[PDB]
Amino acid sequence: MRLPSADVYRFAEPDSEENIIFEENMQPKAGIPIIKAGTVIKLIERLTYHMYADPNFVRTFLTTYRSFCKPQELLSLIIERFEIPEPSAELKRFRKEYIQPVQLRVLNVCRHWVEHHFYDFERDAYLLQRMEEFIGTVRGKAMKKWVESITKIIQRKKIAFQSSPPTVEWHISRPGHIETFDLLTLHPIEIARQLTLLESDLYRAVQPSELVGSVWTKEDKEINSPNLLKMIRHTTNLTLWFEKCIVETENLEERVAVVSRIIEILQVFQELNNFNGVLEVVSAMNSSPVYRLDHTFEQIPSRQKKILEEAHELSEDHYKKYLAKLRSINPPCVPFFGIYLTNILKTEEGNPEVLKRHGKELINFSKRRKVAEITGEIQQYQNQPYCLRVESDIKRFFENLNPMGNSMEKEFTDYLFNKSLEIEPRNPKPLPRFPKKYSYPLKSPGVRPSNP
Amino acid sequence: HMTEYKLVVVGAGGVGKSALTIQLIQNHFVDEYDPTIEDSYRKQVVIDGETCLLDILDTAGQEEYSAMRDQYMRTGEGFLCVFAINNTKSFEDIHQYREQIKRVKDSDDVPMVLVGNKCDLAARTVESRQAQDLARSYGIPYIETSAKTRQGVEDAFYTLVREIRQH
Numbered sequence: 222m223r224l225p226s227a228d229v230y231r232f233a234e235p236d237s238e239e240n241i242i243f244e245e246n247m248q249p250k251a252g253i254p255i256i257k258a259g260t261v262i263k264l265i266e267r268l269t270y271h272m273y274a275d276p277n278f279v280r281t282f283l284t285t286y287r288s289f290c291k292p293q294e295l296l297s298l299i300i301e302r303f304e305i306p307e308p309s310a311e312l313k314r315f316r317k318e319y320i321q322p323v324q325l326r327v328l329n330v331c332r333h334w335v336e337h338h339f340y341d342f343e344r345d346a347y348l349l350q351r352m353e354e355f356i357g358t359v360r361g362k363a364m365k366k367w368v369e370s371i372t373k374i375i376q377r378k379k380i381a382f383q384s385s386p387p388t389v390e391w392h393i394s395r396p397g398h399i400e401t402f403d404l405l406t407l408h409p410i411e412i413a414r415q416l417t418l419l420e421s422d423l424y425r426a427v428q429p430s431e432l433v434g435s436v437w438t439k440e441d442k443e444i445n446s447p448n449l450l451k452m453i454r455h456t457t458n459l460t461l462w463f464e465k466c467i468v469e470t471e472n473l474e475e476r477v478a479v480v481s482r483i484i485e486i487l488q489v490f491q492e493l494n495n496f497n498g499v500l501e502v503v504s505a506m507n508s509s510p511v512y513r514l515d516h517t518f519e520q521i522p523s524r525q526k527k528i529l530e531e532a533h534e535l536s537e538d539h540y541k542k543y544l545a546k547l548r549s550i551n552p553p554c555v556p557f558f559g560i561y562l563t564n565i566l567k568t569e570e571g572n573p574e575v576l577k578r579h580g581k582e583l584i585n586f587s588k589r590r591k592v593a594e595i596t597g598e599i600q601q602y603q604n605q606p607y608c609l610r611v612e613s614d615i616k617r618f619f620e621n622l623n624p625m626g627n628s629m630e631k632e633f634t635d636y637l638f639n640k641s642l643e644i645e646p647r648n649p650k651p652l653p654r655f656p657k658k659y660s661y662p663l664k665s666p667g668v669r670p671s672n673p
Numbered sequence: 674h675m676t677e678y679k680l681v682v683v684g685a686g687g688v689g690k691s692a693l694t695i696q697l698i699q700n701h702f703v704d705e706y707d708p709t710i711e712d713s714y715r716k717q718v719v720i721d722g723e724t725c726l727l728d729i730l731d732t733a734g735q736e737e738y739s740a741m742r743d744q745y746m747r748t749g750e751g752f753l754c755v756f757a758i759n760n761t762k763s764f765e766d767i768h769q770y771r772e773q774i775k776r777v778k779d780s781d782d783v784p785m786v787l788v789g790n791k792c793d794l795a796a797r798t799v800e801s802r803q804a805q806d807l808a809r810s811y812g813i814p815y816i817e818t819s820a821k822t823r824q825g826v827e828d829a830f831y832t833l834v835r836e837i838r839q840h
């Protein structure tokens with residue numbers, strides 16, 4: 222085929238080690254080469270390639286491009302790519318085999334951009350002005366169908382299914398009596414279900430815009446990662462609430478009941494595949510104030526000690542068992558996000574933004590593919606909801622937990638540890654006795670549902 | 674069985690602490706990294722002629738999970754307390770990181786090393802003397818490292834392995 226010069230159309234420049242390099246493997250389901258690195262022009266040529274469509278590359282590119290190219294600069298390149306100059310029998314082939322496919326591909330990119338990364342347009346209303354402009358100028362019977370589609374999505378974006386779930390379980394607290402709700406008064410099955418529902422919505426609300434570019438670690442983390450941060454803060458508040466429940470229960474018999482109830486909640490989190498909930502309990506148990514309460518743990522049934530020991534092993538050997546158990550299960554589940562955060566950060570920190578070949582800078586795409594592989598792994602567990610009925614009063618109770626109160630982390634942390642030393646002094650100080658504080662019975666109703 | 678040392682990197686976030694362990698684990702002319710694979714946190718090394726395995730835990734990115742520190746921290750034999758020489762807050766945070774490590778290990782003598790990392794050509798706001806003074810007050814070594822050039826990294830880790838051995 223014969224194409225115009227680089228002085229009129231930049232995308233016509235042929236492939237070379239100076240502008241594009243590949244990985245030695247091919248896309249498994251597509252047979253398409255895997256780009257390792259390339260220039261922004263060559264990466265945009267492959268994004269809108271004439272010979273074949275490359276969906277994975279479109280999804281990877283649109284998710285991770287903002288590090289190497291600005292949204293307003295990308296629109297201009299995909300507009301420039303569409304505006305093809307001509308270089309009979311030769312012309313009829315070029316129009317059909319290179320102009321029509323390349324144009325169709327930029328329109329597909331535009332549709333993907335608008336459908337899945339609309340945030341770009343919500344943050345730059347001129348970007349949306351130019352998109353609607355460009356789209357308006359596009360003419361052809363072939364185009365009309367995709368131009369109609371893009372417009373229908375923009376307008377939608379501007380506007381902004383199961384069997385019966387189980388019966389909500391109750392223990393001492395009766396429905397409507399929020400005033401009496403606490404760890405031991407609510408049913409442990411319902412505590413775990415209601416926390417799982419909360420934690421599942423928190424997990425499903427996290428977007429790749431909050432992760433790509435390691436933006437949750439930067440100075441504007443509160444602006445760019447609000448949902449991730451609410452999610453981590455909920456987790457932290459639950460661990461702190463479990464530690465507080467334990468160490469503020471000074472009577473050893475009552476405290477043993479508290480820890481046993483928390484292990485019962487952990488068991489139900491295991492049953493529900495709530496790995497975030499599982500580690501909230503493990504973290505609370507392995508905290509400095511709790512880990513040292515030997516008199517409390519001596520009185521805990523071996524079955525519960527073993528349940529806790531198995532949950533802890535998930536974390537061991539750099540989350541080896543956790544990672545296997547997650548691979549072995551299917552949705553719904555609430556994964557532990559921390560691993561994904563460390564893997565995105567280390568991928569971004571441990572790889573160069575650019576590779577140099579014959580003294581020319583190539584953008585390192587592989588680094589972006591690896592980040593995009595993790596964001597996809599996050600998204601694969603965000604689609605499936607749980608078949609559990611919400612209980613609005615138990616939900617609000619957990620949404621409003623504030624164990625720290627008005628204290629700072631250190632001030633609270635020290636208080637928790639001092640309480641731990643108070644209730645179980647350091648050896649050889651003998652064990653003091655403390656008065657009971659619960660006027661209701663401590664026997665658990667169990668983790669097996671009372672109703673079929 | 675060769676000796677396996679469980680090392681824990683601790684420090685403020687948002688200041689390139691991850692570079693330290695990455696540069697250790699990856700080869701001196703290999704700038705590629707996949708945090709997914711096992712080889713990415715275990716390294717065989719020869720220190721003072723005696724071969725050993727270094728198992729490094731760096732939870733870079735999980736700073737907001739503050740209630741998980743105690744757990745992550747209790748797994749370590751020795752600790753690298755990292756700060757950035759262009760960030761005073763990260764230096765001011767070392768006092769509490771160290772107080773936490775001591776509380777978790779239930780010991781005043783924990784193999785520990787203070788690391789001052791230079792992550793960019795930004796202005797140094799922490800003078801080596803401030804840091805050397807602080808390390809002396811705590812009674813631990815001080816190592817400065819460069820993320821750009823790999824200068825100091827090996828000394829930072831080997832000094833900790835020496836601190837564990839001499840404990």
Ligand SMILES: COc1ccc(S(=O)(=O)Nc2nccs2)cc1
Pocket residue numbers: 506507511512518526529530531532533534
């Ligand atoms: C060998 O170290 C451990 C083995 C098991 C556990 S654990 O039982 O999973 N966690 C505990 N937290 C408090 C008391 S017991 C913790 C540590």
